[PDB]
Every structure is written in C-alpha cells, then in structure tokens.
Design a protein around this ligand. Sequence first.
Ligand SMILES: Cc1oc(C)c(S(N)(=O)=O)c1C(=O)O
Ligand SMILES: Cc1oc(C)c(S(N)(=O)=O)c1C(=O)O
Ligand SMILES: [Mg+2]
Ligand SMILES: [Mg+2]
Ligand SMILES: [Zn+2]
Ligand SMILES: [Zn+2]
Ligand SMILES: [Zn+2]
Length: 231
Amino acid sequence: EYPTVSEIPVGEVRLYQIADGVWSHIATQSFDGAVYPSNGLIVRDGDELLLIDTAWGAKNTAALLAEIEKQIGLPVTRAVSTHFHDDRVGGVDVLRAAGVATYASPSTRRLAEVEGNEIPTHSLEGLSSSGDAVRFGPVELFYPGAAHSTDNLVVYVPSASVLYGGCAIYELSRTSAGNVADADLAEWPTSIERIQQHYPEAQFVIPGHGLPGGLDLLKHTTNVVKAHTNR
Ligand SMILES: Cc1oc(C)c(S(N)(=O)=O)c1C(=O)O
Ligand SMILES: Cc1oc(C)c(S(N)(=O)=O)c1C(=O)O
Ligand SMILES: [Mg+2]
Ligand SMILES: [Mg+2]
Ligand SMILES: [Zn+2]
Ligand SMILES: [Zn+2]
Ligand SMILES: [Zn+2]
C-alpha cells in the first residue's frame, strides 16, 4: 500500500493519505549507485496546506508542488524544514520562488549555511532547548535534542495522532546506522525517549526514509544507534 522506490520513477513524487487532512510525500534520488526513498508531510491548514520538508532537491520539489496541485488543489503557503540536510532544505529555492514561506529553526538555518545548502527564509523561535515545543498552525514542532543531527525537529499532528519523526527515526527494515556524520550518537537515545514521553498517544510514526509504522520505530532506532555506538 505505501509506495517503495520501485513504484516511483526518477523525478516523480507520490502522495499517501495517512489520515484526514494528513499526507506523506515520497520521492527518490540515486546516491553511490543505490536508490533511496525520502518522506515529508503535508497537513491541511483550513483551506491552505503546510508542507514539512522538501522532496529532496529542486526537480523533485517542483514535481511535489505539481502533484499537490493535481491531487489536493489547495495552496502550499508555508514549509518547515526539520533539519539542514538536502533531503529537507534541497528545493527551498523552488518553494520560495513559488511564493511559499520557508521556515526552519535558527540552528537549522546556520548549519544549512555552513554546508552551503539552501536556507529557509524564516527563523522559528522557541525550539533551542531539548524538550521545547511550539504550535505552528495545525502541527506541534518539537526539538527532542540532538540525534541524527544537532538541529533535528519532529512534527506532531494532534488532530490525526500522526508523528513525523524525520531522520531521527529509522524505518524497521533499516538495520545499520548509514549517514551519522552530523549525529550526536551519545544523545540520540535520550532524544528518542523525549519523543516517546511527549507523544505516547501517537498512532502513526513516519520516518525520514522508508515505511511508516507505530511507536515501535522509536525503540527500533535506539537499538540500531546503540549497536552502532558499540561498533
Ligand atoms: C538515507 C539518507 O539519505 C540522505 C540524503 C540522508 S541525510 N538526511 O542524512 O542527508 C539519509 C538519512 O539517513 O537520513
Ligand atoms: C546525496 C546523498 O544521498 C544519500 C542517500 C546520502 S547519505 N546521507 O545516505 O550518505 C547522501 C549524502 O549527501 O551523503
Ligand atoms: Mg492538528
Ligand atoms: Mg530509515
Ligand atoms: Zn539528515
Ligand atoms: Zn516571509
Ligand atoms: Zn534523511
């Protein structure tokens, strides 16, 4: 039912309805001769849409806006990037040119600049300290602490009990750490426990890459991170 790499031609985007007024968006890129999927979120905001994360690059993000207009036909007015990597901010220039207001924490904006990545326009206050939360239209933004990156946010949709973990949360089929160059391995399990503490009622948990599941993905990620730590 949820699309895999093999369902998504090069430069195409799929939308998946998770709950009333909540979709994931799924796109792909080749890296080092393998193909990787990437998830973001779309949340209905009255008669507008809130986007969580780009579709990983300018071409995919243009395709995302086209697929949203085709399938949903409500304007994307705001986008939040959940950390500074290219699967999150790659395509911010496309969003900005299309009239979308782009947001990230000041932590994310700084790290994007250092990386020479695209930089969301707006700075989100109130997310600087582990455990901080702010409402942003129909979602809650939560900074659990450093994990996959020092700036990683998670997004909760209270109407739908949907938790978007982003790249701090691994899919169940992922058994090894992969890209941890920017990770805080020491803090990652503590940060995951803050997510469990804040969102124990979550019914749907969406990782940055791969298949959604339930809250089991949190302890799954802790297991993989601790195994990597002890490598
Ligand atoms: C599978 C994957 O692809 C990319 C481009 C990333 S990231 N967010 O580390 O850049 C990851 C990740 O592990 O989050
Ligand atoms: C372009 C890209 O694609 C993937 C899948 C990765 S990563 N973060 O997994 O090594 C990267 C990278 O920037 O390292
Ligand atoms: Mg809601
Ligand atoms: Mg994963
Ligand atoms: Zn990342
Ligand atoms: Zn603005
Ligand atoms: Zn990622």
